[PDB]
Every structure is written in structure tokens, then in C-alpha cells.
Amino acid sequence: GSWEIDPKDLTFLKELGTGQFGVVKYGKWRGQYDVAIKMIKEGSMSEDEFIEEAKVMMNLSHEKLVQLYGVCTKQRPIFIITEYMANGCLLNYLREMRHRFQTQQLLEMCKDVCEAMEYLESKQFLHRDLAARNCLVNDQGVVKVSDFGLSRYVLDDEYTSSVGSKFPVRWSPPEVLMYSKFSSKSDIWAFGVLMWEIYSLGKMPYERFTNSETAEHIAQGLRLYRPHLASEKVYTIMYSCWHEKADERPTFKILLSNILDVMDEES
Ligand SMILES: CN(c1ncnc2[nH]ccc12)[C@@H]1CCCN(C(=O)CNc2cc(Cl)cc(Cl)c2)C1
């Protein structure tokens, strides 16, 4: 099928990482094209459901989304083939103090993510785990959104629900923590936290709190506060993502307009 890549077309060149979901390698497709090859650990994913969804995911083409090129499903482990992003994970990139980022660079990263999310919003597609650890950085410093929708197919019980140890509590609005109500507005909340991660150079949100303490904090109506590098206008944008009432939170189209306005003011 159009979603199926011949694994014989891959040349494996370097290891990019190993973890719970499997092993990621850098390689070439048909000798010429850079790819990331994700080798899925058996039992970690609902593979048939993922393969069906891969057909939809591949039609999601936007310059700020990490592209899904196809899957290799005729051997074990299956492979997922994606765009290669030379500078790796955004969270680690933010934490490398050598870059000495300007705030204009940080705002540009927020805009890259927002553009990807406005596109997903326009397609009624939820990310469901938006956070700096799920964004990647290419050789030009462009940030792109990765692993969109993947959490629906992860089998690990600690990651599946608000009670689990791996659940992204610190990126979740009160209605997710209390009621499991996911919507565009839970992606909005997570985006505001991602903006906070960017302007905090990769600090853990609510860094002094446990997950349980964070959930209590949020339930009481309290919030993150302003990163030192965020201007008042930037803080207003991120804070708007955290209204207790989900329907009072902006859309990604509004956030993008807000971010572009601040870019103009701060250039
Ligand atoms: C180092 N690195 C990259 N470096 C350059 N270009 C890349 N393209 C894609 C990834 C990438 C990633 C940094 C974050 C962690 N990571 C993942 O891919 C995480 N997601 C995942 C999903 C599935 Cl389904 C299976 C598996 Cl094993 C992993 C590798």
C-alpha cells in the first residue's frame, strides 16, 4: 500500500536513541533521503490500530509537523519511518545553555509549534500529548511537532490515564485531570505549558511539586508564573491557555495571531 515502505530500501547508519517504545536509528531511504527509523518494541503499541491511523497521519502535511513517511509491517519488529531532525529533541535543545538564545528565537519556536497546531486544529486532529519532549529541531533550527496522536496506541498502563506515573499531569487542564475530558482545549492548555517550557529554557513545569501536588495546585485555580525571559505580552499569551473554563481558552488560530503580533512588537 501507499503507507508501506520496503525495508530493503533502508540503509541503517547510526543509533539515535533507545527507550521503552524501541530503538530509533538514522538512515537513508533508497540511498539518498535522510530518515529516522523507529523500531517498535514488541508489546509496546497497539500495532493494527496504529497502522490504520498511519493512513490518516500520512495525509497530514505541514512544514512544521514531523512527516510520517510510512511503515514497515511485514517483519517483526515493525518500523515507523519519519522525517529526520538533525538537532534532536526540543527539550534537550532548550537545556543546552551554549545556544545563548535570544527571546526572538524562543518566540519563533513558539510560532513554529503554533503553526503546526493550527493546522492540526483545522483538521480536527488532537495531539493529545503536546510538550517540549514531543517536538524536534532540524538542522536549520526549525521546531516541528512530533508523535502527534501517538498516545492513543501506547499500551503501557502507567501512561494511559490520569492516575498513571507516566501521564503528562503537568501539561493537563483541570477537566482532563478530574474527568478525562480531552478536546482541542486540552491541546491549548498543553501548548501554554510548552510556551512556558520554551521561555524557561527547559525547566520542568511546577518543578518543586510532585504530580499529585501539581494536580491539587491546578484544581485550586493556581498556575505557573512568568518565566524570567517572557515579556508581559508573551506571559499573557501563555496564561490565556490556562483559563479554568475550557471554552474561554483561545483557539490555535487566535494564539498564532497573538504570537505574530508580539513578534512584530518585539523585533
Ligand atoms: C533523537 N530523535 C530524533 N532525532 C532525529 N530525527 C528524528 N526523527 C524522529 C525522531 C528523531 C528522537 C528524540 C526524542 C525521542 N525519539 C523518538 O523518536 C520518540 N518517539 C518514538 C515513537 C515511537 Cl512510535 C517509537 C519510538 Cl522508538 C520512539 C527519538
Short mmCIF file of C-alpha atoms and ligand atoms in Angstrom, two decimals:
data_model
loop_
_atom_site.label_atom_id
_atom_site.label_comp_id
_atom_site.label_asym_id
_atom_site.label_seq_id
_atom_site.Cartn_x
_atom_site.Cartn_y
_atom_site.Cartn_z
CA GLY A 1 0.00 0.00 0.00
CA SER A 2 0.91 3.68 -0.21
CA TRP A 3 1.59 3.64 3.54
CA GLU A 4 4.00 0.68 3.32
CA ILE A 5 7.76 1.16 2.86
CA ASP A 6 10.02 -1.65 1.68
CA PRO A 7 12.58 -2.16 4.50
CA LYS A 8 15.08 -3.31 1.87
CA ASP A 9 15.17 0.35 0.78
CA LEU A 10 16.66 1.39 4.14
CA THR A 11 20.36 1.79 4.95
CA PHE A 12 20.94 1.98 8.71
CA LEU A 13 23.71 4.42 9.66
CA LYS A 14 23.62 5.49 13.33
CA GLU A 15 21.69 4.94 16.55
CA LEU A 16 19.64 7.93 17.70
CA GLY A 17 18.22 6.51 20.92
CA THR A 18 16.74 3.55 22.79
CA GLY A 19 13.88 3.54 25.25
CA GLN A 20 10.65 1.89 26.31
CA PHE A 21 9.00 2.08 22.89
CA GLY A 22 12.01 0.74 20.99
CA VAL A 23 15.10 1.88 19.11
CA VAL A 24 15.43 4.89 16.79
CA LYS A 25 18.05 4.87 14.03
CA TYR A 26 19.24 7.39 11.47
CA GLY A 27 19.41 6.03 7.95
CA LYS A 28 18.86 6.60 4.24
CA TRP A 29 15.90 5.64 2.06
CA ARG A 30 16.92 4.49 -1.45
CA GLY A 31 20.45 5.74 -0.84
CA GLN A 32 19.56 9.43 -0.95
CA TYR A 33 16.94 10.58 1.56
CA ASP A 34 17.55 11.06 5.28
CA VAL A 35 15.07 9.24 7.52
CA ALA A 36 14.56 8.31 11.14
CA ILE A 37 13.72 4.61 11.53
CA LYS A 38 11.75 3.74 14.68
CA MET A 39 11.96 0.02 15.52
CA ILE A 40 8.97 -0.69 17.75
CA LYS A 41 9.48 -2.93 20.78
CA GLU A 42 7.05 -5.83 20.66
CA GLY A 43 4.11 -5.36 23.02
CA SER A 44 4.51 -1.61 23.47
CA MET A 45 1.92 -0.45 20.89
CA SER A 46 -1.48 -1.41 19.52
CA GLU A 47 0.03 -2.01 16.09
CA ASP A 48 -3.03 -2.75 13.95
CA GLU A 49 -4.79 0.36 15.26
CA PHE A 50 -1.66 2.43 14.65
CA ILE A 51 -1.30 1.13 11.09
CA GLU A 52 -4.89 2.10 10.30
CA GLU A 53 -4.31 5.58 11.73
CA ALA A 54 -0.99 5.90 9.88
CA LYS A 55 -3.04 6.19 6.69
CA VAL A 56 -4.63 9.39 8.05
CA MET A 57 -1.40 10.66 9.64
CA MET A 58 0.46 10.50 6.34
CA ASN A 59 -2.01 12.88 4.68
CA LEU A 60 -1.22 15.47 7.39
CA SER A 61 1.38 17.51 5.54
CA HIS A 62 2.55 20.77 7.07
CA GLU A 63 6.08 22.15 7.13
CA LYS A 64 6.02 22.36 10.95
CA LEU A 65 4.81 18.77 11.51
CA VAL A 66 7.38 15.97 11.56
CA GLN A 67 6.36 13.96 8.50
CA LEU A 68 5.37 10.30 8.64
CA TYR A 69 6.83 8.65 5.53
CA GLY A 70 5.38 5.16 6.00
CA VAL A 71 5.55 1.91 7.94
CA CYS A 72 7.25 -1.49 7.54
CA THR A 73 4.71 -4.02 8.79
CA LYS A 74 5.76 -7.34 7.20
CA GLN A 75 8.53 -8.14 9.72
CA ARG A 76 8.97 -8.09 13.48
CA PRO A 77 9.63 -5.54 14.90
CA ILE A 78 7.59 -3.19 12.68
CA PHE A 79 9.29 0.04 11.66
CA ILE A 80 7.86 3.56 11.55
CA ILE A 81 9.73 5.83 9.12
CA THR A 82 9.69 9.59 9.75
CA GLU A 83 11.42 12.86 8.91
CA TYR A 84 14.97 13.19 10.25
CA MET A 85 15.53 16.20 12.52
CA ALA A 86 19.26 16.73 12.96
CA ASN A 87 19.13 18.70 16.24
CA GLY A 88 17.05 16.17 18.11
CA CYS A 89 14.58 16.69 20.92
CA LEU A 90 13.44 20.24 21.68
CA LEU A 91 13.62 19.69 25.46
CA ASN A 92 17.32 18.80 25.32
CA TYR A 93 17.97 21.61 22.84
CA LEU A 94 16.43 24.19 25.18
CA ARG A 95 18.54 22.86 28.04
CA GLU A 96 21.82 23.34 26.13
CA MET A 97 22.79 26.74 27.53
CA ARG A 98 25.51 27.22 24.88
CA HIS A 99 22.92 28.34 22.32
CA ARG A 100 22.50 31.59 24.30
CA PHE A 101 19.09 32.06 22.75
CA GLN A 102 17.57 35.44 22.05
CA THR A 103 13.95 35.80 23.10
CA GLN A 104 13.12 36.37 19.41
CA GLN A 105 14.41 32.84 18.81
CA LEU A 106 12.26 31.47 21.64
CA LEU A 107 9.17 33.22 20.21
CA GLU A 108 9.97 31.76 16.78
CA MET A 109 9.97 28.27 18.30
CA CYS A 110 6.56 29.01 19.83
CA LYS A 111 5.34 30.17 16.42
CA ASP A 112 6.65 27.01 14.70
CA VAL A 113 4.69 24.84 17.14
CA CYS A 114 1.61 27.07 16.95
CA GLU A 115 1.53 26.85 13.16
CA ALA A 116 1.65 23.06 13.31
CA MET A 117 -1.12 23.05 15.92
CA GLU A 118 -3.31 25.47 13.98
CA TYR A 119 -3.01 23.05 11.06
CA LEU A 120 -3.94 20.06 13.22
CA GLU A 121 -6.82 22.07 14.69
CA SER A 122 -8.03 22.86 11.16
CA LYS A 123 -8.07 19.10 10.51
CA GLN A 124 -9.84 18.31 13.84
CA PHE A 125 -6.80 16.24 14.86
CA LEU A 126 -5.69 16.32 18.50
CA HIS A 127 -2.08 15.93 19.53
CA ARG A 128 -3.08 14.55 22.99
CA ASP A 129 0.50 14.81 24.40
CA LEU A 130 1.87 18.20 23.35
CA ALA A 131 5.05 19.09 25.26
CA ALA A 132 8.64 20.07 24.51
CA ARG A 133 9.76 16.43 24.75
CA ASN A 134 7.47 15.70 21.76
CA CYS A 135 8.94 18.38 19.48
CA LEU A 136 12.06 18.09 17.34
CA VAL A 137 14.56 20.57 15.88
CA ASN A 138 16.02 20.38 12.36
CA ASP A 139 19.44 21.47 11.09
CA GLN A 140 18.12 24.99 10.46
CA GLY A 141 16.78 25.37 14.00
CA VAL A 142 13.16 24.95 12.89
CA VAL A 143 10.95 23.30 15.52
CA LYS A 144 8.40 20.72 14.41
CA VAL A 145 5.71 18.84 16.31
CA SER A 146 6.29 15.08 16.64
CA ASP A 147 4.38 11.94 17.65
CA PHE A 148 1.02 13.65 17.18
CA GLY A 149 -1.80 11.41 18.38
CA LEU A 150 0.60 8.60 19.28
CA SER A 151 -0.60 8.21 22.88
CA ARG A 152 -3.83 6.57 21.68
CA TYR A 153 -1.81 3.47 20.70
CA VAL A 154 0.60 3.14 23.65
CA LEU A 155 -0.20 0.09 25.78
CA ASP A 156 1.82 0.99 28.91
CA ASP A 157 -0.67 1.24 31.78
CA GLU A 158 1.35 3.95 33.54
CA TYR A 159 0.85 6.30 30.56
CA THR A 160 -2.82 5.69 29.64
CA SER A 161 -4.77 7.60 32.29
CA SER A 162 -4.57 10.48 34.76
CA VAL A 163 -3.65 8.04 37.56
CA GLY A 164 -0.58 6.66 35.80
CA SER A 165 3.00 7.53 36.70
CA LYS A 166 3.89 8.44 33.11
CA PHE A 167 0.75 10.50 32.40
CA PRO A 168 1.55 14.18 31.45
CA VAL A 169 -0.09 15.67 34.53
CA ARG A 170 1.91 18.88 34.27
CA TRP A 171 0.61 19.50 30.71
CA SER A 172 -3.06 18.76 31.53
CA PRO A 173 -6.03 21.06 32.23
CA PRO A 174 -8.32 20.52 35.24
CA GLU A 175 -11.01 18.85 33.14
CA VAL A 176 -8.51 16.21 31.96
CA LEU A 177 -7.17 15.57 35.47
CA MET A 178 -10.64 15.42 37.05
CA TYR A 179 -12.82 13.94 34.31
CA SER A 180 -10.66 12.70 31.38
CA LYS A 181 -12.26 15.35 29.10
CA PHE A 182 -9.92 15.69 26.11
CA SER A 183 -10.62 18.30 23.45
CA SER A 184 -8.97 20.97 21.33
CA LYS A 185 -8.85 22.99 24.56
CA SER A 186 -6.66 20.41 26.32
CA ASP A 187 -4.19 20.78 23.46
CA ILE A 188 -4.48 24.55 24.01
CA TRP A 189 -3.62 24.19 27.70
CA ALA A 190 -0.66 21.95 26.89
CA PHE A 191 0.57 24.50 24.33
CA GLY A 192 0.62 27.20 27.01
CA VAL A 193 2.76 24.90 29.16
CA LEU A 194 5.04 24.27 26.18
CA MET A 195 5.42 28.04 25.75
CA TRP A 196 6.40 28.13 29.43
CA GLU A 197 8.94 25.32 28.87
CA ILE A 198 10.46 27.25 25.94
CA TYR A 199 10.79 30.53 27.83
CA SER A 200 12.11 28.70 30.90
CA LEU A 201 14.87 27.04 28.82
CA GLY A 202 13.52 23.58 29.54
CA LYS A 203 12.74 23.74 33.27
CA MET A 204 10.25 21.15 34.47
CA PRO A 205 6.84 22.82 34.91
CA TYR A 206 5.93 23.10 38.62
CA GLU A 207 9.48 21.97 39.27
CA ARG A 208 9.22 21.92 43.08
CA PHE A 209 5.98 19.86 43.08
CA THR A 210 5.10 16.21 42.57
CA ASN A 211 2.42 15.27 40.04
CA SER A 212 -0.13 14.91 42.85
CA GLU A 213 0.79 18.33 44.23
CA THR A 214 0.56 19.83 40.73
CA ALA A 215 -2.94 18.43 40.24
CA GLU A 216 -4.02 19.93 43.59
CA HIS A 217 -2.40 23.27 42.68
CA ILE A 218 -4.25 23.41 39.34
CA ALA A 219 -7.55 22.31 40.89
CA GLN A 220 -7.27 25.20 43.36
CA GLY A 221 -7.04 27.61 40.40
CA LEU A 222 -3.34 28.36 40.80
CA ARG A 223 -0.97 28.46 37.86
CA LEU A 224 2.58 28.61 36.61
CA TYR A 225 4.05 32.08 36.80
CA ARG A 226 6.12 34.17 34.47
CA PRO A 227 9.45 32.84 33.17
CA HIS A 228 12.16 35.45 33.53
CA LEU A 229 12.68 35.55 29.76
CA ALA A 230 8.98 36.08 28.92
CA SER A 231 7.79 39.63 28.34
CA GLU A 232 4.46 40.72 29.80
CA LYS A 233 2.77 40.21 26.42
CA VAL A 234 4.28 36.74 26.00
CA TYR A 235 3.15 35.78 29.52
CA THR A 236 -0.37 36.99 28.72
CA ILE A 237 -0.45 34.63 25.71
CA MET A 238 0.69 31.58 27.67
CA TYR A 239 -1.56 32.45 30.62
CA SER A 240 -4.60 32.70 28.32
CA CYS A 241 -4.19 28.99 27.60
CA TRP A 242 -4.91 28.19 31.25
CA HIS A 243 -8.41 29.53 31.85
CA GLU A 244 -10.26 27.19 34.20
CA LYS A 245 -13.19 27.19 31.75
CA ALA A 246 -12.09 25.39 28.58
CA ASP A 247 -14.46 27.41 26.39
CA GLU A 248 -12.73 30.63 27.49
CA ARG A 249 -9.38 29.42 26.12
CA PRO A 250 -8.32 30.70 22.68
CA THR A 251 -8.01 28.65 19.51
CA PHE A 252 -4.67 27.99 17.84
CA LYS A 253 -5.65 30.47 15.13
CA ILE A 254 -6.03 33.20 17.77
CA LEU A 255 -2.81 32.17 19.52
CA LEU A 256 -0.97 32.33 16.18
CA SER A 257 -2.31 35.84 15.57
CA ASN A 258 -1.26 36.82 19.10
CA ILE A 259 2.24 35.39 18.63
CA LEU A 260 2.70 37.10 15.26
CA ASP A 261 1.59 40.41 16.80
CA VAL A 262 4.19 40.09 19.59
CA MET A 263 6.88 39.12 17.06
CA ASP A 264 6.27 42.43 15.30
CA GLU A 265 6.31 44.41 18.55
CA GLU A 266 9.49 42.76 19.81
CA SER A 267 11.59 42.88 16.62
C1 LIG B 1 16.69 11.60 18.66
N1 LIG B 1 15.40 11.69 17.99
C2 LIG B 1 15.31 12.02 16.68
N2 LIG B 1 16.41 12.61 16.14
C3 LIG B 1 16.39 12.95 14.85
N3 LIG B 1 15.40 12.81 13.97
C4 LIG B 1 14.31 12.23 14.50
N4 LIG B 1 13.14 11.93 13.85
C5 LIG B 1 12.29 11.33 14.74
C6 LIG B 1 12.89 11.22 15.96
C7 LIG B 1 14.19 11.79 15.84
C8 LIG B 1 14.21 11.49 18.84
C9 LIG B 1 14.28 12.28 20.14
C10 LIG B 1 13.05 12.01 21.01
C11 LIG B 1 12.88 10.52 21.22
N5 LIG B 1 12.77 9.87 19.92
C12 LIG B 1 11.64 9.36 19.44
O1 LIG B 1 11.52 9.03 18.25
C13 LIG B 1 10.45 9.25 20.38
N6 LIG B 1 9.30 8.70 19.70
C14 LIG B 1 9.15 7.38 19.38
C15 LIG B 1 7.93 6.94 18.87
C16 LIG B 1 7.80 5.60 18.55
CL1 LIG B 1 6.29 5.05 17.91
C17 LIG B 1 8.81 4.68 18.74
C18 LIG B 1 10.00 5.16 19.26
CL2 LIG B 1 11.29 4.03 19.49
C19 LIG B 1 10.19 6.49 19.59
C20 LIG B 1 13.99 10.00 19.11
#
